[PDB]
Design a protein around this motif. Structure first.
Motif, PDB file in Angstrom:
ATOM      1  N   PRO C 427       0.801  -1.234   0.000  1.00 26.68           N
ATOM      2  CA  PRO C 427       0.000   0.000   0.000  1.00 26.68           C
ATOM      3  C   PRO C 427       0.827   1.274   0.000  1.00 26.68           C
ATOM      4  O   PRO C 427       0.270   2.342  -0.286  1.00 26.68           O
ATOM      5  CB  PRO C 427      -0.825  -0.122   1.287  1.00 26.68           C
ATOM      6  N   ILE C 428       2.126   1.199   0.306  1.00 26.47           N
ATOM      7  CA  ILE C 428       2.944   2.403   0.398  1.00 26.47           C
ATOM      8  C   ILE C 428       2.991   3.095  -0.956  1.00 26.47           C
ATOM      9  O   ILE C 428       3.236   2.462  -1.990  1.00 26.47           O
ATOM     10  CB  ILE C 428       4.350   2.056   0.906  1.00 26.47           C
ATOM     11  N   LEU C 429       2.744   4.400  -0.953  1.00 24.82           N
ATOM     12  CA  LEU C 429       2.694   5.169  -2.184  1.00 24.82           C
ATOM     13  C   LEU C 429       4.098   5.432  -2.714  1.00 24.82           C
ATOM     14  O   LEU C 429       5.066   5.525  -1.955  1.00 24.82           O
ATOM     15  CB  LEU C 429       1.967   6.494  -1.955  1.00 24.82           C
ATOM     16  N   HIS C 430       4.199   5.557  -4.034  1.00 25.52           N
ATOM     17  CA  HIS C 430       5.466   5.777  -4.722  1.00 25.52           C
ATOM     18  C   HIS C 430       5.438   7.144  -5.392  1.00 25.52           C
ATOM     19  O   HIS C 430       4.615   7.384  -6.282  1.00 25.52           O
ATOM     20  CB  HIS C 430       5.722   4.671  -5.747  1.00 25.52           C
ATOM     21  N   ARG C 431       6.316   8.041  -4.951  1.00 25.75           N
ATOM     22  CA  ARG C 431       6.454   9.370  -5.529  1.00 25.75           C
ATOM     23  C   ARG C 431       7.892   9.579  -5.988  1.00 25.75           C
ATOM     24  O   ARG C 431       8.773   8.751  -5.752  1.00 25.75           O
ATOM     25  CB  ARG C 431       6.064  10.470  -4.531  1.00 25.75           C
ATOM     26  N   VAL C 432       8.127  10.714  -6.640  1.00 23.63           N
ATOM     27  CA  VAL C 432       9.461  11.096  -7.086  1.00 23.63           C
ATOM     28  C   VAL C 432       9.679  12.574  -6.795  1.00 23.63           C
ATOM     29  O   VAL C 432       8.756  13.388  -6.910  1.00 23.63           O
ATOM     30  CB  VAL C 432       9.679  10.783  -8.583  1.00 23.63           C
ATOM     31  N   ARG C 433      10.896  12.911  -6.372  1.00 23.00           N
ATOM     32  CA  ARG C 433      11.309  14.297  -6.206  1.00 23.00           C
ATOM     33  C   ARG C 433      12.702  14.439  -6.793  1.00 23.00           C
ATOM     34  O   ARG C 433      13.596  13.657  -6.457  1.00 23.00           O
ATOM     35  CB  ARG C 433      11.298  14.718  -4.731  1.00 23.00           C
ATOM     36  N   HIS C 434      12.888  15.442  -7.652  1.00 23.97           N
ATOM     37  CA  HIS C 434      14.090  15.568  -8.481  1.00 23.97           C
ATOM     38  C   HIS C 434      14.145  14.224  -9.196  1.00 23.97           C
ATOM     39  O   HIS C 434      13.137  13.831  -9.803  1.00 23.97           O
ATOM     40  CB  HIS C 434      15.286  15.927  -7.599  1.00 23.97           C
ATOM     41  N   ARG C 435      15.261  13.498  -9.167  1.00 28.95           N
ATOM     42  CA  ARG C 435      15.319  12.135  -9.681  1.00 28.95           C
ATOM     43  C   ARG C 435      15.474  11.054  -8.614  1.00 28.95           C
ATOM     44  O   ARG C 435      16.107  10.024  -8.850  1.00 28.95           O
ATOM     45  CB  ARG C 435      16.457  12.051 -10.698  1.00 28.95           C
ATOM     46  N   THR C 436      14.900  11.279  -7.436  1.00 31.81           N
ATOM     47  CA  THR C 436      14.960  10.335  -6.329  1.00 31.81           C
ATOM     48  C   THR C 436      13.564   9.804  -6.037  1.00 31.81           C
ATOM     49  O   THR C 436      12.609  10.581  -5.919  1.00 31.81           O
ATOM     50  CB  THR C 436      15.547  10.990  -5.077  1.00 31.81           C
ATOM     51  N   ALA C 444      -4.506   7.765   3.866  1.00 34.28           N
ATOM     52  CA  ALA C 444      -5.729   7.083   4.276  1.00 34.28           C
ATOM     53  C   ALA C 444      -5.429   5.833   5.096  1.00 34.28           C
ATOM     54  O   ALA C 444      -6.052   5.599   6.139  1.00 34.28           O
ATOM     55  CB  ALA C 444      -6.567   6.728   3.047  1.00 34.28           C
ATOM     56  N   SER C 445      -4.471   5.020   4.649  1.00 35.76           N
ATOM     57  CA  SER C 445      -4.193   3.725   5.259  1.00 35.76           C
ATOM     58  C   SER C 445      -3.160   3.805   6.375  1.00 35.76           C
ATOM     59  O   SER C 445      -2.493   2.804   6.669  1.00 35.76           O
ATOM     60  CB  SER C 445      -3.743   2.730   4.189  1.00 35.76           C
ATOM     61  N   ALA C 446      -3.018   4.966   7.019  1.00 33.81           N
ATOM     62  CA  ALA C 446      -1.992   5.140   8.042  1.00 33.81           C
ATOM     63  C   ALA C 446      -2.230   4.274   9.273  1.00 33.81           C
ATOM     64  O   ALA C 446      -1.317   4.124  10.092  1.00 33.81           O
ATOM     65  CB  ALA C 446      -1.906   6.610   8.453  1.00 33.81           C
ATOM     66  N   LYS C 447      -3.425   3.703   9.425  1.00 32.67           N
ATOM     67  CA  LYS C 447      -3.768   2.904  10.592  1.00 32.67           C
ATOM     68  C   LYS C 447      -3.513   1.414  10.386  1.00 32.67           C
ATOM     69  O   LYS C 447      -4.003   0.597  11.174  1.00 32.67           O
ATOM     70  CB  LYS C 447      -5.231   3.136  10.976  1.00 32.67           C
ATOM     71  N   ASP C 448      -2.765   1.044   9.350  1.00 33.94           N
ATOM     72  CA  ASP C 448      -2.492  -0.360   9.085  1.00 33.94           C
ATOM     73  C   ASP C 448      -1.618  -0.963  10.180  1.00 33.94           C
ATOM     74  O   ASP C 448      -0.845  -0.267  10.845  1.00 33.94           O
ATOM     75  CB  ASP C 448      -1.808  -0.526   7.728  1.00 33.94           C
ATOM     76  N   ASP C 449      -1.758  -2.277  10.371  1.00 33.03           N
ATOM     77  CA  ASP C 449      -0.934  -2.971  11.354  1.00 33.03           C
ATOM     78  C   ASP C 449       0.526  -3.006  10.925  1.00 33.03           C
ATOM     79  O   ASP C 449       1.429  -2.929  11.768  1.00 33.03           O
ATOM     80  CB  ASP C 449      -1.462  -4.387  11.578  1.00 33.03           C
ATOM     81  N   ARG C 450       0.780  -3.114   9.619  1.00 28.13           N
ATOM     82  CA  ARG C 450       2.146  -3.139   9.113  1.00 28.13           C
ATOM     83  C   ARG C 450       2.884  -1.828   9.345  1.00 28.13           C
ATOM     84  O   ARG C 450       4.109  -1.790   9.189  1.00 28.13           O
ATOM     85  CB  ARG C 450       2.150  -3.476   7.621  1.00 28.13           C
ATOM     86  N   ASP C 463       6.145   5.153  23.772  1.00 29.83           N
ATOM     87  CA  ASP C 463       4.705   5.226  23.552  1.00 29.83           C
ATOM     88  C   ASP C 463       4.409   5.104  22.056  1.00 29.83           C
ATOM     89  O   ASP C 463       5.285   4.790  21.246  1.00 29.83           O
ATOM     90  CB  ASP C 463       4.131   6.502  24.168  1.00 29.83           C
ATOM     91  N   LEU C 464       3.163   5.358  21.675  1.00 29.30           N
ATOM     92  CA  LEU C 464       2.749   5.278  20.281  1.00 29.30           C
ATOM     93  C   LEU C 464       3.006   6.621  19.604  1.00 29.30           C
ATOM     94  O   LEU C 464       2.563   7.664  20.095  1.00 29.30           O
ATOM     95  CB  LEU C 464       1.274   4.892  20.179  1.00 29.30           C
ATOM     96  N   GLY C 465       3.723   6.590  18.482  1.00 28.87           N
ATOM     97  CA  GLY C 465       4.045   7.788  17.740  1.00 28.87           C
ATOM     98  C   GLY C 465       3.018   8.100  16.669  1.00 28.87           C
ATOM     99  O   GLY C 465       1.918   7.549  16.632  1.00 28.87           O
ATOM    100  N   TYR C 466       3.397   9.018  15.784  1.00 31.62           N
ATOM    101  CA  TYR C 466       2.575   9.421  14.651  1.00 31.62           C
ATOM    102  C   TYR C 466       3.352   9.207  13.362  1.00 31.62           C
ATOM    103  O   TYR C 466       4.569   9.412  13.318  1.00 31.62           O
ATOM    104  CB  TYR C 466       2.143  10.886  14.768  1.00 31.62           C
ATOM    105  N   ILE C 467       2.646   8.790  12.315  1.00 36.67           N
ATOM    106  CA  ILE C 467       3.260   8.448  11.042  1.00 36.67           C
ATOM    107  C   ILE C 467       2.882   9.440   9.948  1.00 36.67           C
ATOM    108  O   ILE C 467       3.720   9.803   9.120  1.00 36.67           O
ATOM    109  CB  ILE C 467       2.890   7.006  10.636  1.00 36.67           C
TER     110      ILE C 467
END
Ligand SMILES: [Mg+2]
Lengths: 456, 576, 576, 99
Positions: C427-436, C444-450, C463-467
């Motif tokens: 589910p992790i999204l794939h973006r590009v910045r410059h050529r990286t 939306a899916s930030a609450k996944d167990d993975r 404790d529990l952090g934020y993503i």
DNA sequence: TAACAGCTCTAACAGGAATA
RNA sequence: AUUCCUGUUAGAGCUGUUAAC
DNA sequence: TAACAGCTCTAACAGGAATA
RNA sequence: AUUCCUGUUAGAGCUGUUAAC
């Protein structure tokens, strides 16, 4: 980590025959086309002579008659081809000797054999040759027969009758085809007929077949030794053979001594340089002075530092030297998979280490099967169920495993004395070993060089 | 003076040593010698007047040599290898034409036939690395000089009679290394090679040489006298009060064949107070390598050219396994580092002594000498008491392959260790024949399920075969399937070699079953051998040869344990 | 004549080319020039008559040079860089003592300060590989005697005034290569360097210049005239039938600063029918570098010495991992060979054209130019019609690392392929910045167990952090955890680089959250970064970094599929 | 770019002959001279500093039968310092066979 | 010479302070 | 510019790979 | 120089015959 | 010894590694 370097199977070397036709099967090509040297008339006709005791001459004339008439193969029919008759297959009449071209061994030979004296027996056999000596013009070849009653002097310690006879008659220029009862009584007949006929043609004239795709600018050298067990210590008698295709059509195959005493089979700086000097001087004489460009020195044992330095310093920089060592007994052995019914294809070379390779001089050969064409043939199926490869440990080279491997493969097929399809070792090594045995038996041979047809 | 003494003398004081090389070193570089040079002229002379094809006779033939010499003797010329012959034939062929004589001598001794040998590439190294400073060579060849250009990559200062004063100045200003040719290069007008020219010496060179003699000691090699001018220069040169601090060694290849002139000069020198010695050191080429062998701290840069065989050639890389593939019997041992135990002995021990202690005590451990032991310490305490044991510590073999390749003791020790590990937990019996190890199916347990696959391997037409039994026509010989297992060091890798064999229960009575061993092995073709090797792999490893990395440890319950890991799949490589 | 045409002219005919190197070339060899010799002589003499410390004041100082020159002018000596000065100062210092003069000139130009540069080595290579046969250079010190000897490895026949007739004989008998010094070696008394000696020419050498004129054409470099004897020899040399067959180009580093004698000499030759040309090619070193560059089929053995930088040094091997260990972010890609698809175009295509076709069509496949495509053929049919497609076949990349290193297009293509493979099934999204490329947690899916382990990684005090979320003080900027993933070619290996980053949803509005990006990253110390990297490894691979060899394929349901395998454990190495 | 064959047909080859003259010694057979054009050609070739370095050899079947101009040119060349010679051999073909 | 790919650098700004 | 180098925004410079001219 | 380890060779015998 | 090289039984030769002398 179990995936090794990719191997490549060198294809079966082609053999130059009558009218420059090429065929990788020697006997099939000989039946189909004829000898390579039959294009010119080196042998006008194969005139024979007999030397045997009066009792067993009938065996000699019977075997000669068998050579005259065609024969069919009974054993190893997978490889052998039907004999077409000497006149038909070698295109040269085989002349039976007349009364004066047919000698009788002295009865004193029997007494010496009963006495168990090999040296005197060989001397008496040679001395029986004087009657043929006058008519040296009369007989081209001589078929010396030895009855089984002389077995007590055939082979014992510090002696070998065959080598002594060959060394005694080599300076007298007459080729000799020794015949024992062993191959006089052997069940299969086409085997003996093919072997004896090809030997007879080679010794009377020469070149039954020649290896094709041979660069005239390469001289191949093979060193091999033998041991004479002295009472105090040992004597390591090493001799060197040389093959090359000269500018003329006659492919050359010679051997020579290497000189004093050697305690080890490794040549020193001076001896290696002297032998190599004699070798390229012979090549230059056979090449109107042209320098060899590739030199292959095959040795059964590893080259020391002195030998490699002598090789490097004997030639000039323009002639690259391919110092290679041949290892016969090795632990490795392979099995072809597609697993195959027949073993791995002959000639596959597998680079193990940057300097060490496996060469499969033994193995299945394609395109030489008489019955059921297309089936592979294993030459040593009777002897071994699997082919034992040899190890090539290159001691000096610029690059290319294929260059030396193909040369070795082609050099394994030009042994005219060999009845079978190929040889486990290059002809250089086998002829150097044969001449080493000869010199060990007769030390007074170091002076001269000799062609192959004398000792094969 | 013995030869070993000469090498020791030339090594103790090698920084002050002139060399003298005239026409003797040129023999071994591929340069025709003067004796050969006379024959080349006779050949030209005979072929010229008596119109004969030059190609038809080769001069090194005995018959042609005898015929040409007989022709020469017919016209009243000198008989055989006698003085005033070489110059005589030169002056006969070239009828006093020194330019043409020079051109011919250049062509015969030209710098294209010369191939340097180790003796030559050693003297130039001595020149460059600055032990010998003065080399007077009475040779007009372009070699030793070519040797210096090859070995160091610099230019060497050669002094022909064309200059003839540079050597006297160069030696005085110590701009070494000097190479003064007493008879000069052939590239110049004066060559001084005929006998009439060989009676006089150049005044300034006489000086160069004398200066050199006082300063250094002389070693003269490949020189057989016969020259009056050089002999009288040497005799005068001794006249000097400190002629050769370092003594003069005349190295002849054979003392017996040395000319009497050399011996009487040596006696005269000894009578004049100098320590001149005549020694027999065989060939110059053999002698130079020994002198170089005794040289200490030779630079690597020049030694890479002195002995080109010392560097390792033919490092031709192997290609990839890309794209029928032979399946060998080699199992790669990917283990790189192992741990062993070391015991320190109060008294020196012999590997034979340790072997007999093994034979007597029969411990449950392994030991070798280098004493590295693998197993439990109490076993070693049984072998060696506390009195003879100083300490017991650990040893790490970071590179197993290099270690076994370097020392054969390590090879045998690691082979025995891996063999013990492989047969540690399995019913297959472990025997030895000569210096090899055999894993053999036991007689009693031949009905095991783990042998059934092997039973399939030997079976005929897919039925059930036989694994162990008695020979068909032997009184007591018993036979079984077995595998010879060995350790092979290949390059930088270690492999386990498996070869199927027919083990015979009596060791010395193996030959009586030879036919049977032949008969059982007549039809073990590629398919059958493939099956037997797969079955033996399964028996020895417990896993089929696909993608496996089975790990086996020897003496797992011991403090010193060796843990090897061998891939279960044998070596393979697809064809290119 | 422009320099490029001269190079083509020489390259066209370099077989027959005499060289005439002057004292200018030795300028670089490190040897003192004529002016440097003059200044050394003044300084040597000035300090002795006026007792001043020699080493206290240097010679290349501007003040000391002016003071010494003023002193010299005080005694009425010549003023400044004027003719009859060099010889004047030599004859003044050495008061007609040619032996001492020779010794000093030897010491100043000795063979210890000389360091051969590209020019002399290239000329020596031309000599050895036999394009130029005659090199007459009015120099003294053996920069070339040394340099050609070092690169070829063979000694060089140098000719001088001590014999001086050797050159004509060697020329006549074609004993090439010949290196005749018109003014002779300094080891020899004839040096010919003072002005009175510079008016005459040796008869035999002068004879040689004319005979060699007919055979070859002359290239003269590093020569500025000012010599009457050499100029008149050339003029005599110019005055013969076909004096220079290929023409003579007098090369100068600068045409503007060339003396009128040359230009006068060049104009003079042209009137006598020869094609002599004056060209400017910069310095001698650059000229010879270009000439060697245009040389075809140069032997490797001599070129390994001509350009020592061409061979690769510093191949220092790395040790083993034996015996704290840093844990990098590099995942080794053990894949060695991959399969790709190739399309043949009826018309040539540009990588830019293919990129815009990608932008317009947006297919479900990858393509690059070298056209290698990875994916399904129907996608390519959508991109390219049947008319423009000739055939579609397969491509095999046997060595991936060498391929990506050789061509950067392959690097980008393989990087994109591995990125698509890694984010194909996740589910992790794939973006590009410059050529990286960036793998970023989706909003939306930030609450996944993975992601929960990642939530543990960023958490404070366990404790529990934020993503994912919104910036504290931004109007619309959204932020998330992300990893920059790249392909790195190291030696003969390929690795995947992971770097934790804070992705910002608006691409161009990243800077407005910089403080936040700083603030969130203030306390991401070694432990926290270790945790985040482990969590990202688990997310991207699905397996923890212990003994894993997870394999990922891109477009598994496609005919052309790439199957990579990357070890799940990052690079590590224990300290020695 | 050897080997080269050129016929005089007696200034096109005159420059080439002079260029050839320095490079290698010349031997002339089957020619008695008698032609002033080639005579001046050779005389002009002789003058340079290094002309016919190896030598100029005149090979006639009989020395006494040769024309006087040939001997005059040989003497002139010898006086100039060149190593020209007049040698007596057989017929040109026989001379070349013996060579 | 015109694009395109990567690897690496500097050129302008901005910017907060040593495991909390 | 007491310092430090962390980022942002850009452009070049090299290598290449094609198409040329 | 005396053992010991491996790698490889020849020196004497014996020995049967090309996927069954 | 028409051939082939498969084994058996032995010894050497090289390398080494120690102990020396
Ligand atoms: Mg025979």
């Amino acid at each position: 980590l179990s995936q090794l370097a990719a191997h490549s199977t060198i294809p079966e070397p082609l053999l130059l025959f009558k009218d420059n036709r090429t065929d990788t099967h020697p006997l099939r090509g000989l039946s189909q086309y004829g000898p390579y040297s039959a294009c010119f008339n080196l042998p006008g006709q194969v005139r024979l002579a007999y030397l045997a005791p009066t009792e067993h001459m009938r065996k000699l004339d019977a075997i000669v008659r068998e050579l005259q008439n065609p024969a069919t193969p009974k054993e190893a029919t997978n490889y052998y081809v039907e004999y077409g008759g000497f006149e038909k297959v070698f295109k040269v009449p085989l002349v039976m000797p007349q009364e004066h071209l047919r000698c009788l061994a002295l009865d004193e030979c029997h007494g010496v054999a009963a006495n168990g004296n090999g040296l005197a027996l060989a001397d008496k056999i040679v001395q029986s040759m004087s009657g043929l000596f006058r008519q040296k013009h009369a007989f081209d070849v001589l078929l010396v027969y030895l009855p089984a009653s002389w077995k007590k002097c055939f082979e014992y310690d510090g002696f070998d009758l065959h080598d002594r006879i060959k060394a005694k008659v080599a300076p007298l220029n007459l080729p000799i085809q020794i015949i024992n009862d062993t191959a006089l009584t052997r069940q299969c007949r086409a085997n003996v007929m093919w072997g004896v006929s090809v030997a007879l043609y080679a010794k009377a004239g020469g070149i039954p077949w020649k290896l094709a795709d041979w660069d005239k600018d390469e001289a191949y050298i093979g060193l091999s030794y033998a041991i004479k067990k002295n009472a105090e210590g040992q004597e390591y008698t090493t001799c060197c053979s040389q093959v090359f295709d000269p500018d003329g059509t006659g492919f050359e195959f010679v051997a020579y001594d290497t000189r004093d005493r050697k305690g080890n089979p490794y040549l020193s700086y001076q001896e290696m340089q002297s032998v190599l000097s004699k070798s390229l001087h012979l090549y230059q004489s056979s090449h109107n002075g042209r320098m060899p460009r590739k030199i292959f020195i095959h040795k059964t044992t590893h080259f020391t530092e002195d030998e490699i330095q002598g090789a490097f310093d004997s030639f000039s920089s323009s002639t690259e030297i391919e110092l290679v060592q041949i290892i016969q007994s090795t632990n490795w052995y392979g099995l072809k998979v597609d697993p195959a019914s027949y073993p791995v294809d002959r000639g596959l070379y597998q680079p193990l280490t940057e300097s060490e390779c496996l060469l499969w001089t033994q193995g299945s050969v394609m395109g030489v099967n008489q019955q059921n064409p297309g089936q592979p043939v294993f030459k040593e199926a009777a002897l071994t169920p699997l082919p034992n490869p040899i190890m090539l440990r290159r001691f000096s080279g610029n690059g290319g495993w294929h260059a030396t491997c193909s040369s070795i493969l082609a050099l394994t097929k030009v042994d005219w004395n060999n009845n079978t399809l190929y040889k486990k070792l290059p002809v250089t090594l086998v002829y150097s070993q044969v001449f080493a045995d000869v010199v060990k038996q007769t030390p007074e041979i170091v002076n001269e060089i000799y062609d192959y047809r004398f000792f094969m | 003076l013995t030869d070993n003494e000469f090498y020791q003398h030339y090594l103790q004081n090698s920084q002050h040593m002139m060399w003298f090389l005239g026409a003797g070193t040129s023999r071994s570089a591929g340069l025709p010698t003067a004796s050969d040079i006379i024959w080349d002229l006779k050949h030209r002379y005979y072929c010229l007047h008596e119109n004969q094809d030059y190609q038809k006779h080769d001069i090194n033939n005995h018959a042609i040599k005898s015929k040409i010499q007989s022709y020469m003797d017919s016209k009243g010329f000198p008989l055989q290898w006698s003085p005033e012959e070489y110059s005589f034939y030169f002056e006969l062929v070239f009828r006093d034409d020194y330019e043409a004589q020079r051109k011919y001598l250049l062509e015969a001794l030209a710098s294209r036939k010369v191939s340097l040998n180790i003796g030559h590439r050693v003297l130039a190294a001595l020149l460059e690395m600055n032990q010998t400073k003065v080399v007077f060579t009475t040779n007009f060849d372009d070699v030793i000089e070519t040797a210096f250009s090859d070995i160091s990559g610099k230019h060497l200062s050669v002094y022909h009679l064309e200059g003839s004063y540079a050597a006297l100045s160069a030696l005085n200003t110590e701009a070494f290394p000097i190479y003064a040719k007493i008879h000069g290069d052939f590239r110049y007008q004066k060559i001084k090679n005929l006998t009439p020219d060989l009676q006089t010496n150049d005044r300034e060179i006489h000086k160069c040489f004398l200066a050199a003699a006082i300063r250094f000691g002389l070693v003269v090699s490949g020189y057989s006298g016969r020259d009056e001018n050089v002999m009288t220069m040497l005799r005068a040169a001794i006249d000097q009060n400190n002629a050769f601090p370092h003594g003069l060694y005349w190295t002849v290849p054979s003392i017996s064949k040395s000319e009497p002139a050399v011996q009487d000069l040596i006696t005269y020198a000894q009578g004049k107070g100098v320590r001149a010695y005549l020694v027999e050191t065989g060939t110059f080429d053999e002698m130079l390598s020994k002198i170089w062998r005794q040289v200490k701290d030779k630079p690597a840069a020049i030694d890479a050219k002195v002995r080109t065989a010392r560097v390792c050639p033919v490092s031709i890389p192997l290609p990839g396994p890309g794209k029928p593939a032979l399946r060998t019997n080699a199992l790669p041992v990917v283990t790189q580092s192992i741990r062993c135990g070391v015991v320190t002995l109060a008294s020196p021990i012999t590997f034979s002594e340790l072997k007999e202690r093994i034979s007597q005590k029969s411990p449950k451990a392994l030991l070798t000498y280098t004493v590295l032991f693998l197993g439990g310490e109490p076993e070693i305490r049984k072998i060696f008491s506390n009195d003879e044991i100083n300490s017991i510590g650990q040893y790490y073999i970071d590179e197993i392959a290099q270690s076994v390749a370097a020392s054969t003791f390590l090879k045998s020790f690691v082979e025995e260790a891996i063999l013990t590990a492989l047969l540690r937990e399995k019913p297959i019996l472990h025997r030895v024949r000569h210096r090899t190890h055999y894993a053999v199916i036991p007689n009693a347990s031949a009905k095991d399920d783990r042998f059934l696959d092997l039973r399939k391997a030997v079976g005929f037409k897919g039925d059930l075969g036989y694994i162990t039994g008695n020979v068909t026509n032997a009184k007591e010989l018993s036979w079984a399937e077995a595998v010879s297992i060995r350790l092979e060091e290949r390059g930088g890798k270690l492999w386990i070699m498996l070869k199927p064999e027919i083990w015979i229960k009596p060791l010395d009575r193996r030959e009586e079953a030879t036919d049977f061993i032949r008969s059982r092995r007549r039809y073990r073709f590629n398919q059958c051998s493939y099956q037997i090797l797969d079955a033996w792999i399964k028996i020895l490893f417990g896993s089929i040869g696909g993608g496996g990395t089975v790990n086996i440890s020897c003496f797992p319950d011991a403090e010193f344990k060796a843990e090897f890991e061998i891939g279960t799949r044998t070596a393979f490589s697809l064809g290119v």
